[PDB]
Amino acid sequence: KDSPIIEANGTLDELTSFIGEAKHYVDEEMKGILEEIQNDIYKIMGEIGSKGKIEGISEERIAWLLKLILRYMEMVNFVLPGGTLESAKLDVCRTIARRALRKVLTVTREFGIGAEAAAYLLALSDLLFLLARVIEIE
Amino acid sequence: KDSPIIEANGTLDELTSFIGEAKHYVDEEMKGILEEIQNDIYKIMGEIGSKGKIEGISEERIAWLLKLILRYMEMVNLFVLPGGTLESAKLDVCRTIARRALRKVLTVTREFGIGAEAAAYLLALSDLLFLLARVIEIE
Amino acid sequence: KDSPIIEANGTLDELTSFIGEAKHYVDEEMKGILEEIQNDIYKIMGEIGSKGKIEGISEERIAWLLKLILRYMEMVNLKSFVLPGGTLESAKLDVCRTIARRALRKVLTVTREFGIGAEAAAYLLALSDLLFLLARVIEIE
Amino acid sequence: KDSPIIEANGTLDELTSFIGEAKHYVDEEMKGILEEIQNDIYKIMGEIGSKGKIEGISEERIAWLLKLILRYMEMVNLKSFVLPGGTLESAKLDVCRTIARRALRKVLTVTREFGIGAEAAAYLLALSDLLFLLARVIEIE
Amino acid sequence: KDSPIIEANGTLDELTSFIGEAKHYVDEEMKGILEEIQNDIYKIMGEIGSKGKIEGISEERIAWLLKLILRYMEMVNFVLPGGTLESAKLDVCRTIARRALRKVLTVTREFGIGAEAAAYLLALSDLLFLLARVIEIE
Amino acid sequence: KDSPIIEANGTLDELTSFIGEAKHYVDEEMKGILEEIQNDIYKIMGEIGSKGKIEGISEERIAWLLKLILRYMEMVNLFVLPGGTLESAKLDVCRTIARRALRKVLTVTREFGIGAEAAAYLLALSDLLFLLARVIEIE
Amino acid sequence: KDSPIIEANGTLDELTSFIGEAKHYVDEEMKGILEEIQNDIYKIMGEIGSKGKIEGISEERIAWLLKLILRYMEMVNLSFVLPGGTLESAKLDVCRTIARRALRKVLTVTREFGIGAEAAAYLLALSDLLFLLARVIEIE
Amino acid sequence: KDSPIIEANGTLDELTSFIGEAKHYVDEEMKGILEEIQNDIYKIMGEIGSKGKIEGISEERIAWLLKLILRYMEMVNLSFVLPGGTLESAKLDVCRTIARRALRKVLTVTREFGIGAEAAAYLLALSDLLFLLARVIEIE
Amino acid sequence: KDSPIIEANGTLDELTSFIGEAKHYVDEEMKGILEEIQNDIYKIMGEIGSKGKIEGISEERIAWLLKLILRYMEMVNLSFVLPGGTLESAKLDVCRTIARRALRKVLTVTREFGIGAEAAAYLLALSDLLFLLARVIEIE
Amino acid sequence: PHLVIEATANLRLETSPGELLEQANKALFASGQFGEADIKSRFVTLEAYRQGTAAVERAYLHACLSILDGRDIATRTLLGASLCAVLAEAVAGGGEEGVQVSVEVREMERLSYAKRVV
Amino acid sequence: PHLVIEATANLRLETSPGELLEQANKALFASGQFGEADIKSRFVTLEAYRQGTAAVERAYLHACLSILDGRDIATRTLLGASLCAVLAEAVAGGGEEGVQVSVEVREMERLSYAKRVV
Amino acid sequence: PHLVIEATANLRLETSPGELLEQANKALFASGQFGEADIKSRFVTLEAYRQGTAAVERAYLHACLSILDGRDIATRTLLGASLCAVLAEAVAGGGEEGVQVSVEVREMERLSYAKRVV
Amino acid sequence: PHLVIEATANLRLETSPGELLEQANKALFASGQFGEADIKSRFVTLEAYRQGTAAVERAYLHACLSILDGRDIATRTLLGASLCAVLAEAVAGGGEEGVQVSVEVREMERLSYAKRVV
Amino acid sequence: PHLVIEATANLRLETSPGELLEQANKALFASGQFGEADIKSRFVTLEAYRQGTAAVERAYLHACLSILDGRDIATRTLLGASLCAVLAEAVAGGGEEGVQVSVEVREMERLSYAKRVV
Amino acid sequence: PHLVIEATANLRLETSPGELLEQANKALFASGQFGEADIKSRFVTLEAYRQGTAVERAYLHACLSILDGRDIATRTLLGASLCAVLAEAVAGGGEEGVQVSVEVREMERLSYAKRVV
């Protein structure tokens, strides 16, 4: 396939692997949230690898992300990354999500596809930041 | 001292460091396998950094990887999310970084005509890491 | 707004996150060293993101890194190349070292295209050397 | 949205229109053959305009064209090059054949740039051969 | 003159010649409409060849085309081109109008002139389609 | 097998086919003239397709075209809309396609340095086709 | 009148002139072989200058070169030697190097125009034969 | 110090060296002619190396070459012949081919810098004269 | 298998062949010098053809060339002369020009691949020594 | 597509704004570029307005058509011309001189455009 | 940024336009791309409106978000999606069928943008 | 060109909207970029509006100038600055703090722009 | 051109390999891309053959057409389709399931190709 | 994919040719690049064969794997290495020296490739 | 390199297939491009064959497979050598002349696997 497509799929796969690694340090609610995020990232990878031939995520996934972002923003009032080990894992996941966002943005500029995927990745990075801060507070 | 050479060597160093991190969560057999893999990756790093002047891995390393792949495929029922357990999650991360190193070495091969055996080794290593993660999940 | 700037900032964020993850496996002195390193990396990211409009790290930070490097070379005696990760704590620092090398490459691209961040690149190189030394020190201990 | 795609679809529409114009000068068998050809060309236009996301013609269409080509080659015996348009009906088919060659060139450009339409180009080549044979058959009859 | 200008003028000449050929198979009102269209094309040809120095068609020509289009859509409710020979002639004219539209669009992109000419050619292709369908229905 | 060569040959084939289609609406003299024109286009197509290796038309063909052109200007009062009659409309279509073929042959001449006489023949042919259409309209 | 065509023709003319110079130091059979080679090079020159319009050498010329090469390999047994053991073999060594230069020029022409593959094969076989002839002269 | 300038000067030096080698196989008149040719080539080399700053050859040198060419054409009647009918004529054939190579280099210099048209004309006339001299030696 | 590498090796082979041709006109001392030069050129050819994988000449070869250059400069007193005062010196003049051509090719290789600086220095010193040897033969 | 029609309070129309919007929607749908239910038109009356600097009573009618990107300048120009013809035909008069009628066709970014059906 | 929300007169909202604008402003501020006081939102009710050509009662809700240029398509798409989700949540119903909700994100030229505080 | 001035209901102006539009039109004509009768200005009052998320009463004044393409960034910036100066001088007060006044100069596509005089 | 047809031993053909090669040669000559005597075809039966890893008995028919370079993808695809149709129409059966028929069209380098008649 | 294995008549194999083909098919399927039923393998014994010019009788084993294009050099090299390892493991001996085992991986053009199932 | 010689059953050769393979291997080794033991040649007789659509014919075809990295001059010379060697070995066959052809194709060097047991 195309070099940007392969790079974006590889980076999204790496993000999924890191999220799967980090989901073993959180509680049940956050573990379920991270598993749903992993399923969404698989859907995004499918639609990116198919070059848009296969439909990707729907808008209600981004709506769900934004609802979680608001719910965790009302619980969060400058710190170094990794106040605890669990929050450090999510900080690493957030940085890798931003890297995947950069790759998907390159794909979007090249081929005109994946704008919703890029929006999902941006909201996911915001949610990961919020979750790390929530664990630090708790 | 070319940019693709530096990038590929750095990514292979990343892969070696991540494999060294992950080898502390596996049993003795897998730990020995991962140490052998680390030695092979160092050999690949040397031959890439020397721009092909230093000989790299031999074909019996790829044969050893393929034998391990067949052995572990004999016991793997081959869709799950990555990281069913933490130990398999570490190997999934190593697998994705192996794919990244494979991409970098493929760029080096396309531009300089060297490292086809290294790229084949990295592909087989990614397959083996996937199989090992699934084996740990099953066990 | 430039792609090299975004890549360098993202990779430096990755380095900071990995250092923050690894600082929970070391003792108090090394943890303080790593927190100071994280603060320096934040200062470097401010520099890079401003594209030179905001001042970055000072030379006494690189001097501090060099002092640590010599102090730990006084304790490290290696006879041959060793596989990374003889212990889990040293493996974490080896991962941090490799990501520091990646961030150094990104900052070198930024410097080569914009003429800024030479001191940041020197800091990243010294940080890679210090991370290698710290991993070997943990392995020895 | 691409210039070669628009050009190829326009030329295929032109070929379909010319075939529809020429089908009013032939007998019932040839008129049915030309209507089937028009349907196949519309299927090709859909495939090209979708840029491969919509399936196009099947292999049995090309097989049908080849069978017709063999059947009409069994009835055509030429000894030298002849002027196009010995009769008005054969002149229509000669014009259709030349426009089929133009559409083949456009589809070949599309195939070279996007990797799609090899079967469409094969169909257009076989269609050019069949149109030549049909014109010669009309001249003979 | 430049090569895109020469190509656009040649294709417009082809369209005019084909319309003149097809106007001998239609009735009196459509023949008069096609003669008016031929005069409009000649104004378009002049303004294209002059590279914008000579004024072209006015907006009331496009208004007249749109009035005809609405009138004939009032009479038209997938078919292969050329249900009859008369409609096949107009289908050929429509395809050549599409080709002329492509050439004029290239001219407009490269030199900033001929937007009204391109709009006229688009409306002309629509009207030719409608006229072919009307002839088929009648 | 170059793109401009293939395109020019295709357009010349189109012109020949349209001339052969239009020759069935004219009288005997014009039909014979159009047949000789088709033969000249065959020679032009061979010359262009062979990259100039095969000899094309001679200068007496262009002289014959010019003699016809003057003969028909002697009886033409020389703007009007194309297609005053169906027969003249056919020749107007042939004239426009001859101009298109002239453009393609001019391109071929610009890259390859061949076909100047063919381009001159096509220009004279377009002038003659215009004159013949006007003659049909007058008659 | 392309630059690579002119360069290849000039280098082939150089090779012909050097072969004509060197043919005055060899015996009768080698002199006749060299005159035949000069005629073949002239045919190659015509073919290249015409850009393929005029036919060049035939395959039986390359077959003749290969037969000579086999015949002289039957008489040559080498280890490494320096060029020019004698003056006569030095002339043929110079001819061999200029044949390699002409081969490079004809290869450029072939890569840019699709013509002269058989001419390049002839030049390669000619360089091999010149090497063999120089070694034969040294041995004798 | 441009690459085409250095190439042209090197090729002209090579031509001078080959002419100096070949002048030891001809008689006194041709030897004097070749020495004058060498001096003219040195003037051309100075002019090209200075990149037009130093004046080169005059038009009376080309006139002298043309007079020699006419004189020797009065004595030459040819059909096609292979280069090097005699060793002395083969030397001049080699000189002629190297003169044409130098002409190509000087033509490249002229196309890229606008200098050396008279030098290129001199080299063309020199190649014609060398051909004529080789044929004259062959006839004699 | 790069174009500049092939061109440089071909030109070095040309230089070796011409040196081997010219070594049959000099005395025993110069003949031994030229044979050593040919061996050094073969080492240079191996180094260039390997693209630096195989080591080439050492610095003591260039030192030996410079010592010879100084020795022969102690015996040479020049004004301007034309190449080829004698046939023996004309051979060395041709060798010097071909050495400069090989130097140009090796310089192109060095600019494009970063290898062969010592080879280029050796070729420059070799051209100087060939000039000196030609003048020495003319004086003697 | 979105169509906003701006009219001054002193402008007199042959038909009411409802019929004007019906005519505009029919003209837009006749182009074939839009779905029937996707054409959303709206009419706005301007109560505070001045045209130019002279002390002359004037009326003007402006419409902005917003469409998604990806259409050619020929299509955009034809849409503008059709809308302008409909609007000019709908104008009865207003002010002390002629009424200026203008139509804008502007493209919305299709990539960031959000759409839901409730 | 500037937010303009357009609703037909027959559209029924779960909350009044004030609460709708509060929710929209909170959603915009949650993105982190804007200052708190720079978010300016406004609600407009349309009295003369037509959707499509069919004789079916219809309602629609359209919002246009104007932001200064320099933000990526990911940010623009996320802003549009957030606004569309808020608006769809705010819609109670209207017309005889489903209500179409659409959001435009358009970029204003930052270089020529004038801003002053009195 | 087209100028739309949007003001919140709580905003107090030194002069009435008519004089505000007169001053804006004079400022636009003073640039020399437009014909006198081509300058069409309109004033809109907003009744449903929110600024930010804080519970503080605010007022804002926004204007959008739409011009055809082909003018440089210097001309666009000067037009925006002139409009912003006029609007700021026109503001008397409103809300509990300072009034934010902003002007956007957006650029119309001239090639597809339709214009007619009835 | 060179045509090699490879068939497994368990494959049953409607006609013998001689008539199969006659049909293939006629199909190749019907394209007009080759001289009559230049078409060289050959049929090979495979005695040792595996298809896949399952235990089900299978048969397959493969052909490789080798032509000189310089022909377009349209010609190559048409030749492949002609050969595939001719081969599929000649298969009576074989194995316990359907027979897979495949045709490759590969280009031979024209410059290095040597040919002569003895 | 198509696999052709060529062995000299004097070559001795540890297992039967059918077992070798089954092992090769398993090795190819283990790569994951091919469907199970699409892997077609065949074994050919050579009766007339020469290796080199020396008067020493030898043995060799060559395999050619033909796959459709679109796969990277890493995949091609891994497939070749897998096949070579399997073949070398299958070799028992032959001749008076070592047996040379070689594997080619060549690409078939996908656009002109024809495939039917009967 | 790999050399496959395909001959029809009705073709008559001056020498045996083994001697033809010997001559072909000698011709290939004389080029200096290959190692001695790397030249592997094989002769195949065709029992089911057709040439053209008309007459008994015989043809002799050879395919030389070499690793990539050699120039068109070397490839053409190898093809010409093989064609000459094959032509000298043809005695006759059929009722017309025997067409002898040699095709030289390049194998990809990077993906080529080679082992010695």
JSON list of N, CA, C and O in Angstrom, two decimals, chain C residues 82-106:
[
{"chain": "C", "resi": 82, "resn": "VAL", "atom": "N", "xyz": [26.83, -5.33, 26.44]},
{"chain": "C", "resi": 82, "resn": "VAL", "atom": "CA", "xyz": [25.89, -6.19, 27.16]},
{"chain": "C", "resi": 82, "resn": "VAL", "atom": "C", "xyz": [24.49, -5.95, 26.62]},
{"chain": "C", "resi": 82, "resn": "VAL", "atom": "O", "xyz": [24.18, -4.87, 26.10]},
{"chain": "C", "resi": 83, "resn": "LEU", "atom": "N", "xyz": [23.65, -6.98, 26.72]},
{"chain": "C", "resi": 83, "resn": "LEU", "atom": "CA", "xyz": [22.27, -6.86, 26.29]},
{"chain": "C", "resi": 83, "resn": "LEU", "atom": "C", "xyz": [21.50, -5.90, 27.19]},
{"chain": "C", "resi": 83, "resn": "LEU", "atom": "O", "xyz": [21.66, -5.93, 28.42]},
{"chain": "C", "resi": 84, "resn": "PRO", "atom": "N", "xyz": [20.67, -5.04, 26.61]},
{"chain": "C", "resi": 84, "resn": "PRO", "atom": "CA", "xyz": [19.86, -4.13, 27.43]},
{"chain": "C", "resi": 84, "resn": "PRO", "atom": "C", "xyz": [18.90, -4.89, 28.32]},
{"chain": "C", "resi": 84, "resn": "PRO", "atom": "O", "xyz": [18.36, -5.94, 27.95]},
{"chain": "C", "resi": 85, "resn": "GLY", "atom": "N", "xyz": [18.68, -4.35, 29.52]},
{"chain": "C", "resi": 85, "resn": "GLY", "atom": "CA", "xyz": [17.70, -4.92, 30.42]},
{"chain": "C", "resi": 85, "resn": "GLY", "atom": "C", "xyz": [18.17, -6.13, 31.20]},
{"chain": "C", "resi": 85, "resn": "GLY", "atom": "O", "xyz": [17.45, -7.13, 31.27]},
{"chain": "C", "resi": 86, "resn": "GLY", "atom": "N", "xyz": [19.36, -6.07, 31.80]},
{"chain": "C", "resi": 86, "resn": "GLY", "atom": "CA", "xyz": [19.75, -7.11, 32.73]},
{"chain": "C", "resi": 86, "resn": "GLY", "atom": "C", "xyz": [18.85, -7.17, 33.95]},
{"chain": "C", "resi": 86, "resn": "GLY", "atom": "O", "xyz": [18.68, -8.22, 34.57]},
{"chain": "C", "resi": 87, "resn": "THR", "atom": "N", "xyz": [18.26, -6.03, 34.30]},
{"chain": "C", "resi": 87, "resn": "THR", "atom": "CA", "xyz": [17.25, -5.92, 35.34]},
{"chain": "C", "resi": 87, "resn": "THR", "atom": "C", "xyz": [16.12, -5.05, 34.79]},
{"chain": "C", "resi": 87, "resn": "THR", "atom": "O", "xyz": [16.32, -4.28, 33.85]},
{"chain": "C", "resi": 88, "resn": "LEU", "atom": "N", "xyz": [14.92, -5.21, 35.35]},
{"chain": "C", "resi": 88, "resn": "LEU", "atom": "CA", "xyz": [13.76, -4.49, 34.83]},
{"chain": "C", "resi": 88, "resn": "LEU", "atom": "C", "xyz": [13.93, -2.98, 34.96]},
{"chain": "C", "resi": 88, "resn": "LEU", "atom": "O", "xyz": [13.57, -2.22, 34.04]},
{"chain": "C", "resi": 89, "resn": "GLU", "atom": "N", "xyz": [14.47, -2.52, 36.09]},
{"chain": "C", "resi": 89, "resn": "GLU", "atom": "CA", "xyz": [14.68, -1.09, 36.29]},
{"chain": "C", "resi": 89, "resn": "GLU", "atom": "C", "xyz": [15.67, -0.53, 35.27]},
{"chain": "C", "resi": 89, "resn": "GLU", "atom": "O", "xyz": [15.47, 0.57, 34.75]},
{"chain": "C", "resi": 90, "resn": "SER", "atom": "N", "xyz": [16.74, -1.27, 34.98]},
{"chain": "C", "resi": 90, "resn": "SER", "atom": "CA", "xyz": [17.68, -0.82, 33.96]},
{"chain": "C", "resi": 90, "resn": "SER", "atom": "C", "xyz": [17.09, -0.90, 32.56]},
{"chain": "C", "resi": 90, "resn": "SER", "atom": "O", "xyz": [17.45, -0.11, 31.69]},
{"chain": "C", "resi": 91, "resn": "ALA", "atom": "N", "xyz": [16.18, -1.85, 32.33]},
{"chain": "C", "resi": 91, "resn": "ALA", "atom": "CA", "xyz": [15.50, -1.93, 31.04]},
{"chain": "C", "resi": 91, "resn": "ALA", "atom": "C", "xyz": [14.62, -0.71, 30.80]},
{"chain": "C", "resi": 91, "resn": "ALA", "atom": "O", "xyz": [14.54, -0.20, 29.67]},
{"chain": "C", "resi": 92, "resn": "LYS", "atom": "N", "xyz": [13.95, -0.23, 31.85]},
{"chain": "C", "resi": 92, "resn": "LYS", "atom": "CA", "xyz": [13.15, 0.98, 31.72]},
{"chain": "C", "resi": 92, "resn": "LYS", "atom": "C", "xyz": [14.02, 2.16, 31.30]},
{"chain": "C", "resi": 92, "resn": "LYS", "atom": "O", "xyz": [13.64, 2.94, 30.41]},
{"chain": "C", "resi": 93, "resn": "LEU", "atom": "N", "xyz": [15.19, 2.30, 31.91]},
{"chain": "C", "resi": 93, "resn": "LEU", "atom": "CA", "xyz": [16.10, 3.38, 31.54]},
{"chain": "C", "resi": 93, "resn": "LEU", "atom": "C", "xyz": [16.70, 3.18, 30.15]},
{"chain": "C", "resi": 93, "resn": "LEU", "atom": "O", "xyz": [17.01, 4.16, 29.48]},
{"chain": "C", "resi": 94, "resn": "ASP", "atom": "N", "xyz": [16.88, 1.93, 29.72]},
{"chain": "C", "resi": 94, "resn": "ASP", "atom": "CA", "xyz": [17.33, 1.69, 28.35]},
{"chain": "C", "resi": 94, "resn": "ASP", "atom": "C", "xyz": [16.28, 2.14, 27.34]},
{"chain": "C", "resi": 94, "resn": "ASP", "atom": "O", "xyz": [16.61, 2.74, 26.30]},
{"chain": "C", "resi": 95, "resn": "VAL", "atom": "N", "xyz": [15.01, 1.87, 27.63]},
{"chain": "C", "resi": 95, "resn": "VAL", "atom": "CA", "xyz": [13.93, 2.37, 26.78]},
{"chain": "C", "resi": 95, "resn": "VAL", "atom": "C", "xyz": [13.93, 3.89, 26.77]},
{"chain": "C", "resi": 95, "resn": "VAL", "atom": "O", "xyz": [13.76, 4.52, 25.71]},
{"chain": "C", "resi": 96, "resn": "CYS", "atom": "N", "xyz": [14.12, 4.51, 27.94]},
{"chain": "C", "resi": 96, "resn": "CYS", "atom": "CA", "xyz": [14.21, 5.96, 28.00]},
{"chain": "C", "resi": 96, "resn": "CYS", "atom": "C", "xyz": [15.38, 6.49, 27.18]},
{"chain": "C", "resi": 96, "resn": "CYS", "atom": "O", "xyz": [15.26, 7.53, 26.52]},
{"chain": "C", "resi": 97, "resn": "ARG", "atom": "N", "xyz": [16.51, 5.79, 27.20]},
{"chain": "C", "resi": 97, "resn": "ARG", "atom": "CA", "xyz": [17.67, 6.20, 26.41]},
{"chain": "C", "resi": 97, "resn": "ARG", "atom": "C", "xyz": [17.38, 6.15, 24.92]},
{"chain": "C", "resi": 97, "resn": "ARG", "atom": "O", "xyz": [17.74, 7.07, 24.17]},
{"chain": "C", "resi": 98, "resn": "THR", "atom": "N", "xyz": [16.74, 5.08, 24.46]},
{"chain": "C", "resi": 98, "resn": "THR", "atom": "CA", "xyz": [16.42, 4.98, 23.03]},
{"chain": "C", "resi": 98, "resn": "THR", "atom": "C", "xyz": [15.43, 6.07, 22.61]},
{"chain": "C", "resi": 98, "resn": "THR", "atom": "O", "xyz": [15.56, 6.64, 21.52]},
{"chain": "C", "resi": 99, "resn": "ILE", "atom": "N", "xyz": [14.44, 6.36, 23.45]},
{"chain": "C", "resi": 99, "resn": "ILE", "atom": "CA", "xyz": [13.49, 7.42, 23.12]},
{"chain": "C", "resi": 99, "resn": "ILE", "atom": "C", "xyz": [14.17, 8.79, 23.17]},
{"chain": "C", "resi": 99, "resn": "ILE", "atom": "O", "xyz": [13.82, 9.70, 22.41]},
{"chain": "C", "resi": 100, "resn": "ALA", "atom": "N", "xyz": [15.16, 8.95, 24.05]},
{"chain": "C", "resi": 100, "resn": "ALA", "atom": "CA", "xyz": [15.95, 10.18, 24.05]},
{"chain": "C", "resi": 100, "resn": "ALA", "atom": "C", "xyz": [16.75, 10.33, 22.77]},
{"chain": "C", "resi": 100, "resn": "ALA", "atom": "O", "xyz": [16.90, 11.43, 22.25]},
{"chain": "C", "resi": 101, "resn": "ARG", "atom": "N", "xyz": [17.28, 9.22, 22.24]},
{"chain": "C", "resi": 101, "resn": "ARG", "atom": "CA", "xyz": [17.95, 9.27, 20.94]},
{"chain": "C", "resi": 101, "resn": "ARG", "atom": "C", "xyz": [16.98, 9.67, 19.83]},
{"chain": "C", "resi": 101, "resn": "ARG", "atom": "O", "xyz": [17.34, 10.44, 18.94]},
{"chain": "C", "resi": 102, "resn": "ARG", "atom": "N", "xyz": [15.76, 9.13, 19.87]},
{"chain": "C", "resi": 102, "resn": "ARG", "atom": "CA", "xyz": [14.77, 9.52, 18.87]},
{"chain": "C", "resi": 102, "resn": "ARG", "atom": "C", "xyz": [14.44, 11.01, 18.96]},
{"chain": "C", "resi": 102, "resn": "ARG", "atom": "O", "xyz": [14.36, 11.71, 17.93]},
{"chain": "C", "resi": 103, "resn": "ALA", "atom": "N", "xyz": [14.25, 11.52, 20.18]},
{"chain": "C", "resi": 103, "resn": "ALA", "atom": "CA", "xyz": [13.99, 12.94, 20.36]},
{"chain": "C", "resi": 103, "resn": "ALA", "atom": "C", "xyz": [15.18, 13.78, 19.91]},
{"chain": "C", "resi": 103, "resn": "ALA", "atom": "O", "xyz": [15.01, 14.88, 19.38]},
{"chain": "C", "resi": 104, "resn": "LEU", "atom": "N", "xyz": [16.39, 13.27, 20.13]},
{"chain": "C", "resi": 104, "resn": "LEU", "atom": "CA", "xyz": [17.59, 13.96, 19.66]},
{"chain": "C", "resi": 104, "resn": "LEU", "atom": "C", "xyz": [17.60, 14.05, 18.14]},
{"chain": "C", "resi": 104, "resn": "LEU", "atom": "O", "xyz": [17.96, 15.09, 17.58]},
{"chain": "C", "resi": 105, "resn": "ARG", "atom": "N", "xyz": [17.21, 12.98, 17.46]},
{"chain": "C", "resi": 105, "resn": "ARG", "atom": "CA", "xyz": [17.12, 13.02, 16.00]},
{"chain": "C", "resi": 105, "resn": "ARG", "atom": "C", "xyz": [16.10, 14.06, 15.54]},
{"chain": "C", "resi": 105, "resn": "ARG", "atom": "O", "xyz": [16.35, 14.82, 14.60]},
{"chain": "C", "resi": 106, "resn": "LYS", "atom": "N", "xyz": [14.94, 14.10, 16.20]},
{"chain": "C", "resi": 106, "resn": "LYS", "atom": "CA", "xyz": [13.91, 15.07, 15.82]},
{"chain": "C", "resi": 106, "resn": "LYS", "atom": "C", "xyz": [14.39, 16.50, 16.04]},
{"chain": "C", "resi": 106, "resn": "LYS", "atom": "O", "xyz": [14.18, 17.38, 15.19]}
]
